[PDB]
């Protein structure tokens, strides 16, 4: 029930806290992504930067849950989402503030890589994806932030086979959505609770 799993979790908004506090997350994530690299784990830089992207309306569960899955990469700020910033209390907040535009961006998936193009996809399934898109993925959820921006975004909510090798031609990629949602699970969270809000 991956499926389940990935649908629950692209459909949440991305201030929900998944039934995770501050207190639980510290402790998770210390050793992970930048947590660790940036801040060497010290638990009040954490705290510091999870109370930041709070504020800007980007929930401490889905932040920290992604800088977990991403890990650190050269060059790149928390969430490996673009160029880093010049620190990392400065890359934290512009990051948050990114992610609540894009939760909010206009768009429709995006069903083939424009810089590997191969078409594979089947035609009912890209019907199904466009049609929850336009119609389920509400402003300010976690799909809607990355569907429509890269083709691997939309593979991991509609069409996990995409990821593989076998179908996109190009490489394996991983599924940001599915590993948020073991990860959260993992932790002791929920997927099925009360949830979040478009603030």
């Given at each position: 029930n991956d499926?389940?799993?990935?649908?629950?979790?692209?459909?949440?908004?991305?201030?929900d806290d998944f039934g995770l506090t501050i207190d639980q997350l510290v402790p998770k994530v210390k050793g992970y992504g930048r947590f660790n690299v940036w801040l060497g784990g010290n638990e009040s830089k954490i705290r510091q930067v999870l109370k930041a992207v709070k504020e800007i309306g980007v929930s401490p569960t889905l932040f920290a849950v992604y800088e977990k899955n991403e890990g650190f990469s050269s060059g790149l700020g928390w969430l490996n989402h673009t160029s880093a910033r010049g620190d990392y209390l400065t890359d934290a907040k512009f990051i948050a503030r990114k992610l609540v535009s894009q939760s909010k961006q206009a768009g429709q998936p995006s069903w083939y890589d424009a810089g590997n193009i191969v078409h594979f996809v089947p035609q009912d399934v890209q019907r199904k994806g466009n049609a929850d898109f336009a119609k389920?993925?509400?402003?300010?959820?976690?799909?809607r932030a990355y569907i429509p921006l890269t083709a691997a975004a939309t593979w991991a909510a509609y069409y996990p086979l995409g990821l593989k090798a076998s179908?996109?031609?190009?490489?394996?990629?991983?599924?940001?959505?599915?590993d948020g949602a073991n990860t959260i699970l993992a932790w002791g969270g929920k997927l099925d609770g009360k949830g979040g809000s478009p603030s």
């Open positions: 499926q389940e799993k990935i649908d629950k979790f692209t459909h949440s908004y991305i201030n389920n993925m509400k402003a300010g959820t976690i799909g179908y996109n031609k190009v490489q394996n990629y991983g599924n940001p959505f599915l």
